[PDB]
């Protein structure tokens, strides 16, 4: 089930503004986060916006959500998370 599998994902930083707005939408406050915190609020955002497939809860259908605009994706799988990590490398600054 979604948060269970989300928690299994592999990977202090100031998110760029498009990502920051997504994190604030998920209940995050301020601008300075650990990667652990960033991943946690991304999961919370995905859960409150119900972007995951009820049937296939590793699939996130993020298209025509600002998260899909940010990722440049219609979708990603938590089983093949490379596109999320591509966006995180572009959108977290030390």
Chain positions contacting Mg ion, by CB under 5 A: 7, 30-32, 40, 43
Minimum CB–partner distance for residue 94 and Mg ion (Å): 15
27: which 2 tokens?
Answer: 């209940």
Minimum CB–partner distance for residue 44 and Mg ion (Å): 7
Q: Which residue is nearest to Mg ion (CB)?
A: 30
Which CB atom, from 11 or from 31, has the smaller least distance to Mg ion? 31
For 48, other C-beta atoms within 10 Å of its C-beta total 11
Greatest alpha-carbon span in the chain: 38
């Amino acid at each position: 089930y979604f948060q269970g599998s989300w928690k299994l994902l592999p990977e202090q930083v100031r998110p760029k503004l498009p990502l920051l707005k997504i994190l604030h939408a998920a209940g995050a406050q301020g601008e300075m986060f650990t990667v652990k915190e960033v991943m946690h609020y991304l999961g919370q955002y995905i859960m409150v916006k119900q972007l995951y497939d009820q049937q296939e809860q590793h699939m996130v259908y993020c298209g025509g959500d600002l998260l899909g605009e940010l990722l440049g994706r219609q979708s990603f799988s938590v089983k093949d998370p490379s596109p999320l990590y591509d966006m995180l490398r572009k959108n977290l600054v030390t």
